């Protein structure tokens, strides 16, 4: 009676992607981003944008028939920060508030055993 999905959330510095899919992950059920629910580029990464996108995806999720999901949060990873930012947290909260049962939470950020050089250079970046 309980059908499970996978809510893949990607929280970047400049935007948050909320994606729900089948257990295999190949079928997309609904994809909504921070830019979807906002007017200004500066507010794409805002938690408020994430909450609206989460609410949007949740409505479609119920519409299709999926009632539970397994959340796989991740960040940019690679040569950049590994921890999901506030936006993914807000989206994760929104899904819980949406009423969809949350199956399992995991962090699947790309962690490189070895990585190429970063964009900043020797003197750094992120002034």
């Amino acid at each position: 009676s309980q059908v499970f999905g996978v809510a893949r959330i990607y929280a970047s510095f400049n935007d948050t992607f909320v994606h729900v899919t089948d257990l295999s992950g190949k079928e997309t059920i609904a994809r909504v981003t921070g830019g979807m629910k906002v007017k200004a580029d500066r507010d794409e990464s805002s938690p408020y944008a994430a909450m609206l996108a989460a609410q949007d995806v949740a409505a479609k999720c119920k519409e299709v028939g999926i009632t539970a999901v397994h959340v796989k949060i991740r960040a940019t990873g690679g040569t950049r920060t590994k921890t999901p930012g506030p936006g993914g947290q807000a989206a994760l909260r929104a899904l819980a508030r949406s009423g969809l049962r949350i199956g399992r939470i995991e962090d699947v950020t790309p962690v490189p055993s070895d990585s190429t050089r970063k964009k900043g250079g020797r003197r750094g970046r992120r002034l």
Binding site: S1, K62, E63, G65
Partner: protein, 240 residues
């Protein structure tokens, strides 16, 4: 998940009530007083439109309700409700006794089309997306037999019984590819059919009008087409 009853003449929302789960299937009896609600949780809610209270709450289906058919007549006690879920399960609920009278499983895919007609004994026409049509015969007793299974070549979005000019029983099936066709129950052959549009489209439903004289073919592209089958049925041409 809020049912709202709106009165056209009065033009205000007479009744508002809450349902257990989202419901995408709504059926109103021909007598225009009862409404059956098919939720994705398998629960069936029957509401009196004029009064606005729950009359029946049938919870037997496991899958999502995909089709609901009210059977009844004015000044009769043989009132029945037929419900089909997405699991190919069909149940004939009896309103007067408030119980499930029959259970059918031969369908494998979702059941989208239901129709009961009285045999001068009652006949049920069940059609689903599995591209088959099943004709059942049954009564108030523990009798429910399958008569025929028609491979209709088309995904059955909606189906029902139709009467010819001479009185011959006919079955109308509107489905995928945006085609509406008519099949004799006995022969099983398609008498008449509509031309398939070049654009891929589906008939999401059919709306009987004027004692089944003309039907509105609702298409997935939000376009309604009116066909007068009774005149077309008289026409010898096999194209509607």
């Amino acid at each position: 998940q809020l049912l709202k009853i709106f009165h056209l003449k009065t033009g205000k929302v007479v009744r508002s009530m809450k349902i257990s789960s989202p419901s995408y299937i709504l059926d109103a009896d021909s007598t225009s007083t009862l409404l059956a609600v098919g939720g994705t949780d398998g629960s069936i809610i029957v509401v009196d439109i004029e009064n606005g209270y729950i009359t029946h709450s049938f919870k037997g289906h496991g899958g999502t309700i995909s089709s609901l058919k009210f059977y009844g007549q004015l000044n009769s006690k043989i009132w029945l409700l037929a419900s089909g879920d997405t699991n190919g399960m069909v149940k004939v609920w009896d309103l007067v006794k408030r119980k499930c009278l029959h259970t059918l499983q031969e369908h494998t895919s979702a059941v989208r089309g239901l129709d009961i007609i009285e045999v001068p004994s009652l006949n049920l026409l069940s059609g689903g997306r599995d591209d088959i049509i099943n004709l059942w015969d049954f009564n108030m007793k523990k009798k429910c037999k399958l008569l025929k299974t028609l491979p209709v070549n088309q995904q059955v979005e909606s189906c029902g019984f139709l009467k010819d000019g001479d009185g011959k029983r006919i079955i109308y099936t509107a489905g995928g590819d945006a085609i509406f066709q008519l099949i004799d129950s006995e022969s099983g052959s398609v008498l008449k059919r509509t031309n398939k549009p070049i654009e891929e489209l589906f008939i999401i439903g059919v709306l009987p009008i004027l004692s089944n004289s003309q039907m509105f073919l609702v298409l997935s592209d939000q376009t309604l087409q009116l066909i007068n089958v009774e005149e077309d049925l008289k026409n010898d041409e096999d194209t509607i």
